[PDB]
Structures are given as C-alpha cells and as structure tokens.
Design a protein around this ligand. Sequence first.
Ligand code: MG
Ligand code: MG
Ligand code: MG
Ligand code: MG
Ligand code: MG
Ligand code: MG
Ligand code: MG
Ligand code: MG
Ligand code: MG
Ligand code: MG
Ligand code: MG
Ligand code: MG
Ligand code: MG
Ligand code: MG
Ligand code: MG
Ligand code: MG
Ligand code: MG
Ligand code: MG
Ligand code: MG
Ligand code: MG
Ligand code: MG
Ligand code: MG
Ligand code: MG
Ligand code: MG
Ligand code: MG
Ligand code: MG
Ligand code: MG
Ligand code: MG
Ligand code: MG
Ligand code: MG
Ligand code: MG
Ligand code: MG
Ligand code: MG
Ligand code: MG
Ligand code: MG
Ligand code: MG
Ligand code: MG
Ligand code: MG
Ligand code: MG
Ligand code: MG
Ligand code: MG
Ligand code: MG
Ligand code: MG
Ligand code: MG
Ligand code: MG
Ligand code: MG
Ligand code: MG
Ligand code: MG
Ligand code: ZN
Ligand code: ZN
Lengths: 80, 24, 91, 48, 112, 252
Amino acid sequence: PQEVSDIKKFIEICRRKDASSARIKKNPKTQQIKFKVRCQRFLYTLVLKDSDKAEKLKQSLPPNLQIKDVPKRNKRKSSA
Amino acid sequence: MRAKWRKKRTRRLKRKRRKVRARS
Amino acid sequence: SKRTKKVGISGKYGTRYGASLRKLVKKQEVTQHARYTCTFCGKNSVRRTAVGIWSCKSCKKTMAGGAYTVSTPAAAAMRSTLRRLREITEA
Amino acid sequence: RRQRVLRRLLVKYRASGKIDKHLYHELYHLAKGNTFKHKRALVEHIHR
Amino acid sequence: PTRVTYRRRNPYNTTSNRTRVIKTPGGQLRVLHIKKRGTAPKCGDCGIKLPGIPALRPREYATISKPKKTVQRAYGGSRCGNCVRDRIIRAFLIEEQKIVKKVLKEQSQAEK
Amino acid sequence: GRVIRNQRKGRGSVFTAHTRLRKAPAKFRPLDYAERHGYIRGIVKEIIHDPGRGAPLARVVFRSPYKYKQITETFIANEGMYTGQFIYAGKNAALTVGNILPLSSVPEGTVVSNVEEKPGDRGALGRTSGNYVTVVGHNPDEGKTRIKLPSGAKKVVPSSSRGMIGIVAGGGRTDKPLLKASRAKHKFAVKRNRWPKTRGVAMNPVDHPHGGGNHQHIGKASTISRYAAQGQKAGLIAARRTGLLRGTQKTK
RNA sequence: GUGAAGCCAGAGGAAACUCUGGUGGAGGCUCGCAGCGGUUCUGACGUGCAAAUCGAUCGUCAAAUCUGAGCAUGGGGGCGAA
RNA sequence: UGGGGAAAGGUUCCAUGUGAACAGCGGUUGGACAUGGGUUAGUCGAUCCUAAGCCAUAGGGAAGUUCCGUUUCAAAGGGGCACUCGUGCCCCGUGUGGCGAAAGGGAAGCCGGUUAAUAUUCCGGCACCUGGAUGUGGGUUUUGCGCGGCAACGCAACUGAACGCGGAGACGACGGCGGGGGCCCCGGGCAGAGUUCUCUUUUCUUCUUAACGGUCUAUCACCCUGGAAACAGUUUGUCUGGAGAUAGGGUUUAAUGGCCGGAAGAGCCCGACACUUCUGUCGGGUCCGGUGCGCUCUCGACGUCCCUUGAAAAUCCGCGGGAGGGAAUAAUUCUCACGCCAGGUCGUACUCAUAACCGCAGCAGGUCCCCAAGGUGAACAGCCUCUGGUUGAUAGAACAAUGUAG
Ligand SMILES: [Mg+2]
Ligand SMILES: [Mg+2]
Ligand SMILES: [Mg+2]
Ligand SMILES: [Mg+2]
Ligand SMILES: [Mg+2]
Ligand SMILES: [Mg+2]
Ligand SMILES: [Mg+2]
Ligand SMILES: [Mg+2]
Ligand SMILES: [Mg+2]
Ligand SMILES: [Mg+2]
Ligand SMILES: [Mg+2]
Ligand SMILES: [Mg+2]
Ligand SMILES: [Mg+2]
Ligand SMILES: [Mg+2]
Ligand SMILES: [Mg+2]
Ligand SMILES: [Mg+2]
Ligand SMILES: [Mg+2]
Ligand SMILES: [Mg+2]
Ligand SMILES: [Mg+2]
Ligand SMILES: [Mg+2]
Ligand SMILES: [Mg+2]
Ligand SMILES: [Mg+2]
Ligand SMILES: [Mg+2]
Ligand SMILES: [Mg+2]
Ligand SMILES: [Mg+2]
Ligand SMILES: [Mg+2]
Ligand SMILES: [Mg+2]
Ligand SMILES: [Mg+2]
Ligand SMILES: [Mg+2]
Ligand SMILES: [Mg+2]
Ligand SMILES: [Mg+2]
Ligand SMILES: [Mg+2]
Ligand SMILES: [Mg+2]
Ligand SMILES: [Mg+2]
Ligand SMILES: [Mg+2]
Ligand SMILES: [Mg+2]
Ligand SMILES: [Mg+2]
Ligand SMILES: [Mg+2]
Ligand SMILES: [Mg+2]
Ligand SMILES: [Mg+2]
Ligand SMILES: [Mg+2]
Ligand SMILES: [Mg+2]
Ligand SMILES: [Mg+2]
Ligand SMILES: [Mg+2]
Ligand SMILES: [Mg+2]
Ligand SMILES: [Mg+2]
Ligand SMILES: [Mg+2]
Ligand SMILES: [Mg+2]
Ligand SMILES: [Zn+2]
Ligand SMILES: [Zn+2]
C-alpha cells in the first residue's frame, strides 16, 4: 500500500481495467475520511480531512466499480 | 548485463523480426 | 612510580622460567614492540605484523625485514658492499 | 565521570569566551593529570 | 515476561540463524528470522569503501537499476576516484617522458 | 615384539602434512626465450605470511609475452623488498637486490638465494630464513661454477643456473627460546604431529629396542651400523666419532 | 583479588639521571559458581538403584579447557604425554 | 519437575468401549486391550555448490579374487547462423568426470482466526522471488545512443560483441567504550478486583501495532575556501596535523530512530439488554512522562597476543575495450511505471526422558541445543515468592535391642 499525494491521480487509478472494488471508511473521532481502491497488486488509499469533497468525489468517480462502506465489527461468513 | 538476460533479449527480438517477416 | 627495579617488560612471567631466560627473552622482546620511523613517508608509524613483515600505518607500505628488527647488520653490510662493488666495477 | 564533567566545563568556557586556547590547552593537560579534585576547585583555579 | 522459542527446525546458533524479538498486534512476544548483513564494495587499488553505493547481498544486485549501482564517471565502480586522478596524471607524464626519451636518440646517437 | 614407532611414519595415515592454509608453492618462472636473451619486469603486489614456515612470501605480477593475459607466481622475499617494487628477470638484468639473473653473470663475492641445482627446477638451494650461498669461482670454458653452501660444503653447478640476489628474510628467528610448551606445540602442530616425544629407555621391551629393565639404561652400544635391518636403526646412526666437540672440525 | 609494558602531571640535580600521585589492563597468575575429573572417609549398598551407583569432603576453571556431526588408520596389524 | 528442537523411537497422537493379562499393593484409571479417525507448502527443509575424503576413465602390476593411478608418457571439448526440411557452413580451444554437510555457502510470507487430533501449509486480508510470454504510458533521436553540480556526487529511464581487470560470497581469540530493540524499575490518569478493629489519595491486572513501502535523520570517511610555534585539536584508554591541522560550508555507507499507509475494520478490558436453542444485540476505553557501571541480543570506532596470522566452490555485479545494429515522420536491444501465465517431487502426528532413546525392564545410570521474572546479596552463590507444572513412587498402628543419616 502507498499513499497518493493529491486528488488528481485517484481518478486515473480508479479508471483502470483491474480496479476490482473500492470502499469508504470514516473516522468520527479524528474527523477523517479514507478512500480505498483495490487493484491486483496494491491497495491505494486517499486521506481527506474535510467532508465536502468526499461526496463530490464519490459521484465523480465512474459507476462501474463497486463501492462499499465497511460496516462496523466486520465478521466472517459463519454466523457471529 | 549478464548473458541470460542478453540471451532472452535477443531471442525476443528474433521473434519480433519473424513476426514482421510474416506480417509483410 | 617505577613499579619495577630491574625486571622491566618481562614481569608478566611472574616467578617462572628462571632469571637468565627471562633476561634473554626481555632483551629481544623490547625491540619488537617499539615503533620505528618509515623510510618512505618519514612518519613514525611502522609496526610488526608477521614474523618478518613490517608495515607503515600512514603510507600503507609493507616491507620484509628481519624477525624482530626492520634490518639486520649482515644484510646492511651486504647491500652496502654490493653497491660499492657494482659501482667500482661498472664505473 | 570526572573526566567528562571537567572536559565539558572546559569546552563550555572556551566556546563562551571566558578563556582562550593557550590557557585551554594547559588546563586540559592539568585536568588529565590528577590535579583538580572537583568542579569548585577547577573554577577557583581559573579565577585565580 | 514471556519467553520465546524458535520457529524453524535448526536448533543451533550457527551464524546463519539470525533472530529478533518482536511484539505482535495480538499482544504476544515472538521471534522473527532475519538474513545476514550486506558488505559495501571496496576500491580496486587503495581498498576503501566506495561512497554512494549501497551494501547488499550478492544476489540482490540483479534487481536494482543501473544508475543506483554506479557513479557517472570513468571507472565508476571499483575505483574511488583518487586512484583515477593518479592514473590520469601518471599516464600523461609517462607518455611525455617516453616522447622526450625517444626523440633524444636519433640526433644525439645517430648523427653519424 | 611389535613394529617400532619410527617405522609407522612411512605409511602416511596419521603422520601426513597439514596443507589446508597454504595457497601455492614457491617457484621461479619457467625458463623461456625472453629471460634467456633479454629481460622482463614485474610488480610486487603483496608481502604475505604463510603458516608452517618462516621467510615471508611475496606476490609478484608479470605480463604475458605471447597472449593477452597475466600470470601470477610466488617467490621468496629477500630482506629489504617492499611493495610496489619493479623486479627484473633475464640475462641482461641489472645487479640489484631482488633481481633474477643467471648465475654466470655475477662477479665474485655476491650472495644469492633459491639457486637451482640444474637450470629449470625452480629453486633448490638456500631458501630458508637467514641463509644464502656464495660463489667462489667460474670456469669460462667447460662452463661450471664453484659455490659454497650454508652447511659449509662446496659444490660445482652448471653455469646456466639461476639465482636471486640478496639474503632470505626472517633474520635470527631461532635466537629467543620458545620458553613455553604452547608455542612449540603450535609450531609442530601446524606442520605435522610430532610434538609428543617418548624416550626409548622408558619404553617396553616389546615396543623399542632400548626396552625395559629394573633400571633405566640402554644395555648396549648406541652406535648402529650403516647397513642394519629395518627396525634396528634406533639410536646413533653411522657415527664417525662421539662426545663433546672440543677442537676444530677437520671436515670442510 | 593481585596489577606487566605504554601515557599524564608534579618535585630534586650542573649533568648523567633520580623520586611522588594517577592513568592503563598483560599473565599457560589467583579465590570461587555451571561444566570436566575422581584424593580421603579405606562411609552407604555389596543375591544392590546400578555386572562400578549414592552422600559429604576434594583437583582444575579463559587455557596443553569441554564438546557435536562428517572422514582416515584393521589383528603379529592400528593407536599410545608410555 | 516450564515452553520447543537434533540424533533415536514408529502410531506411542485423538475419540468411544472393555471379560482375562501387565502397571512387583488395589484400580471404575493407563504410554495396556478392542473399534474408528488424524500429518495439506513456488516462500520452512531436502533438491544446488564445494571441504577432509571416496570411486569410474588413460595407463602400469598380479596365476587370480583384484592393487596402484584422479591429469598423469591420452587424438579426451562447445558456440553461432541459414536453409520448406535435420542432413550445409563459420568461429574458439592450456584441461578434461561423479559422490560427499537436515550445525558450512544459499533467490522469495507476515498478521488474525479456525479442529477432539495438523498448520509461517487451512480460511480472510495484505506482500515477495524465479521462470516464461506481450501491450500501453513516459524517456531518447533530424548534432544518431540523457541532463545538473568546481568537486565528493545526484535522477524514474538513459546502446555495448570477443577478451581482460576488480569487488561481494570470504572468516582468530580477548579487553573496555558508545548507539539501537526487548526485559526490569518509578510518577500521573481511565476501568475492574482484594483488604478495612485501626491505618493506608492504598495493593494487583489490561492500556498492544507484524511482514512490506514512502518521507526526514543517525559514527567512519570524502570534497571546497584558507595556511598553523606563545604549536593546536582530542579519547575512559596519546593519537592526529605543510603528504595541509583548527574553523566555515557540503556529499555519502549504515534504521531494530520519528511520522504516514498496512491499521483498527484487528486483538484486549468493562458495562447493559433480550433469551430454550438456531441465536445474539447495543454502548464506551484501549493514554502521558522519567531513570541506569541494571539483564540479554545486535551494530560501530579503538586496543592487545602469535617462531600459532586464523577454508574452498556455486552464484551475482561494476569497469577497460569498441563488434554489430538503428530515426524524421516516425523508430526503439529504454536495467522506468503498469499489465499476462506458471512454479514439479519427498518429510510435516507425538516423546526427546526419575515411563515414548541405550543399558535383558515403566532401571536413583548415560545422552547434543534455544528462551530466562521479583526480593536479600558483589553475583547464573545460598534461601523465599510470581507465570507455568506437579501433589507420582505399596499402606495402617506402636516407638525394644543393633543399625543408616542429623
Ligand atoms: Mg563476461
Ligand atoms: Mg643456546
Ligand atoms: Mg619425554
Ligand atoms: Mg613402565
Ligand atoms: Mg627387541
Ligand atoms: Mg640390540
Ligand atoms: Mg637415568
Ligand atoms: Mg591457572
Ligand atoms: Mg561426575
Ligand atoms: Mg564419588
Ligand atoms: Mg568402602
Ligand atoms: Mg547387607
Ligand atoms: Mg510440551
Ligand atoms: Mg489403529
Ligand atoms: Mg499389581
Ligand atoms: Mg488385580
Ligand atoms: Mg481395569
Ligand atoms: Mg463396571
Ligand atoms: Mg477411558
Ligand atoms: Mg493418550
Ligand atoms: Mg495397542
Ligand atoms: Mg529456504
Ligand atoms: Mg554439478
Ligand atoms: Mg580405484
Ligand atoms: Mg592395465
Ligand atoms: Mg552433491
Ligand atoms: Mg545451512
Ligand atoms: Mg506439530
Ligand atoms: Mg499462501
Ligand atoms: Mg562497458
Ligand atoms: Mg565459514
Ligand atoms: Mg550497551
Ligand atoms: Mg506503523
Ligand atoms: Mg571539519
Ligand atoms: Mg496509522
Ligand atoms: Mg476496538
Ligand atoms: Mg548468549
Ligand atoms: Mg499461483
Ligand atoms: Mg527436553
Ligand atoms: Mg531413567
Ligand atoms: Mg528401553
Ligand atoms: Mg542490590
Ligand atoms: Mg539466584
Ligand atoms: Mg512435564
Ligand atoms: Mg519403592
Ligand atoms: Mg510406614
Ligand atoms: Mg532404637
Ligand atoms: Mg551416630
Ligand atoms: Zn610510511
Ligand atoms: Zn582507490
């Protein structure tokens, strides 16, 4: 995993053939937003301190790849 | 530039030229 | 603050091996641990590595000499006589 | 311990400017010799 | 104060079983095995370690890019540069003395 | 009885020589046209010490007269040699310490070392720390040279033999006593096992000719004949005389 | 625990040299644990735990110290600080 | 008397059941008896290379089973191209076998969970090495094969045939000193637990961050200006300096250092609520400093000792040299970024010992290693305690002689 410094290169990363999926994680305590995209080799992560650009990016990115919201207390397939 | 990598590089070019020969 | 009367460096042997043998070993040991001036660079840093090898710590040159001294009187007299003989004979 | 404390005092004085290098070198060799027992005895020697 | 154990079949401390103690996010103290430490290459003539070149095991040098393994000048590797300056000076002056030595002979010894 | 101790050393099972730490033997270059008619030069790279021997060795690098390559050899270093020296080999080489030139081209009174008994055997005579041989006279017709060996003997050698100027380094190594059991034990250990020494009088009759008895004594003359059966030569062998050397030695 | 060379400072003397306080950390040196060995009680047991063990007391302990695996020497032969 | 290994043992490992025999007494219990089950690997080893050493080949002995011989009195080999097609050519030549290490050299995987019995292998997440195939982005070029800095050198790339030189692999014992990780110790804060006749802002436990990457730094050393005696700098330990010190400014080998991803979504500790089971659910916390001749491992600069100087090979890299090949409308033999496919064979259960090895046996004997808490104390001395592990060696009553030990 490797940081992406700015906003600009995230959309080219997300518009690739091997972008399997993506997810959104929110940290209320630290007021932080994490954007993750999964390629074959790496897991790109983008960190945002503000909240306004998050929705605009969410709708700007292509609709083809799926996006999840990482529910709390992630559990295995077998019942808790 | 060791011989194993040079050997692969020239064989790769050899096939690129055979493909060009069959393309023409 | 001399710590010794006459025994000197060979005091590490305690009271063993006899006075004469300690004197003979001390006389030859004293000249082996000292430092000698280099003949090439001139600095005073040349020390013994092997049984017949001496090397300078500054110019890193290494020279083959005697067992416990850089040069021997026999070898010095032979080099001098050979130089004299050659120069008189051929010049 | 004593050697570092004495040397640290000497370097502090040299850097500040209370003493010069000619006195510094002599005091360094007197500190190397068993001359000064402690910090107060040394500072008294500089004052005198 | 928990004690640790090896994780491989070799039970002896034989300069190839290199270990470190780590604490895991599971709150346990285990052992992690490490390889040996690389050595920096030395100079061909004087014998000192070259600056600007990393120290790795001999196999890892095949995965590193070329500019990271050399320095952009003549005798980039294996020579420090002081030896290169000595080589340049020695070569020029020696050839100059060879020219003057060879030129002297035809006039001073073949004038007859 | 059984086989005595000095007969077992010939089987070469335990009494061999330790040779793991020795890199190469010390020899001259092969005799060639360049060294027979002119001279060649080489650089002295290193002065090294090899185990089991005095007389530190020297590493020399020469060129190749026939091919684009270099050949490494190993000589014995004379006292005064230093790293970076140019050394010369051939018929017309200069007469300085360390040079190698045929034994004919030398005026009387010079000392050499590592002299070949015959031209091309790469050194046979005088190659130990602090020893040398001296030339006595030449015979220009029917070429031959008289030499004097370290032991005092006199010899006649062919005039085409080679020798390298100077005196073997190492000086007076054997002057200070070993003074300690360890230092001697190491010295013999690094070469061949012989450090335990067993007196024949303390032996048993089955083991040694000196045998046992109610007192420690030999029982017979200790001088053994020149022609004796194997297993009997244990003692003073072919002694010409016996006792303390008072006068001068007639043999020369 | 003892404290060999080398080094620093002070004192004496015309000189050659001589004294004092530190620093330094050498020795097949020394007391003493683990390991290795096996002096005395001529102790215990002596159809024993054991076809050589057990307890107290002992020798050495940074060097001729202790030790694992792989290889070599085979019976009038090997190996042996005997 | 804990938690795991090498050699050796070979199912002794787990579950269910049990008449006789064994466990020198008993037995519902067992390492015993009977019936079933259990050992998953491109990354951990073997597989590769050589050491001491062993055995073929050329040759010589011996009536012979066979002995010597390992580069030796030998005609001993391998690299490229084009042809529909192998069958035709062109170069180099001093040399030319195999076996031998689960402790020597060596390409690559970490965390959490899961089973009655296996896991660095199984599941989930995040990576790496080798081999083999191909396309985009960017770079270079009409001056044909890159720019910057005086310099040590720097960057995402940035031609190199035959031959040759060099480095890494690659190495002794001991002594003190400095940096880092882990352990131990002290203070504050948030939770839970123990004691309370009296005292104690009291005593105890949890407070964690892996492989793999990005970014800023850390001894030695090196470069530039300038030219030193009233000599200077300096280590615990006197070495360094016109062969260029002090001073000022820079480059670089070396993270088990700081921050960010991985990563809180994990793990752990409390509380509160349902409630047959199948099932759960919802709230919070998971911090801030100090100290040292402390213990252990690791790194660096010094010093001492030798008539003792402390292995080899496979494999990998740079350079000197200049063979060949290649664009102006595209071509490209770019060690840069991304992208495609594959990685065979065998071992993996358990003990390693006052019961799983060897001693005729469930024998006070023997048998090679790793981890190492608190107090007293100079201390791995002796004595008490915490984690963890046992309570297993035929028993009951009485206290004469003679004994063994104190
Ligand atoms: Mg090559
Ligand atoms: Mg004598
Ligand atoms: Mg004897
Ligand atoms: Mg006897
Ligand atoms: Mg007899
Ligand atoms: Mg007789
Ligand atoms: Mg006698
Ligand atoms: Mg002793
Ligand atoms: Mg014993
Ligand atoms: Mg006993
Ligand atoms: Mg008895
Ligand atoms: Mg009895
Ligand atoms: Mg266990
Ligand atoms: Mg079964
Ligand atoms: Mg019974
Ligand atoms: Mg019964
Ligand atoms: Mg039963
Ligand atoms: Mg029943
Ligand atoms: Mg049962
Ligand atoms: Mg069981
Ligand atoms: Mg059974
Ligand atoms: Mg492996
Ligand atoms: Mg092979
Ligand atoms: Mg054979
Ligand atoms: Mg034959
Ligand atoms: Mg093999
Ligand atoms: Mg290994
Ligand atoms: Mg297992
Ligand atoms: Mg896997
Ligand atoms: Mg090149
Ligand atoms: Mg090794
Ligand atoms: Mg430390
Ligand atoms: Mg982190
Ligand atoms: Mg400076
Ligand atoms: Mg983080
Ligand atoms: Mg949590
Ligand atoms: Mg240790
Ligand atoms: Mg795969
Ligand atoms: Mg065990
Ligand atoms: Mg037992
Ligand atoms: Mg048994
Ligand atoms: Mg204390
Ligand atoms: Mg204790
Ligand atoms: Mg147990
Ligand atoms: Mg019993
Ligand atoms: Mg009873
Ligand atoms: Mg009684
Ligand atoms: Mg009694
Ligand atoms: Zn010098
Ligand atoms: Zn150099």
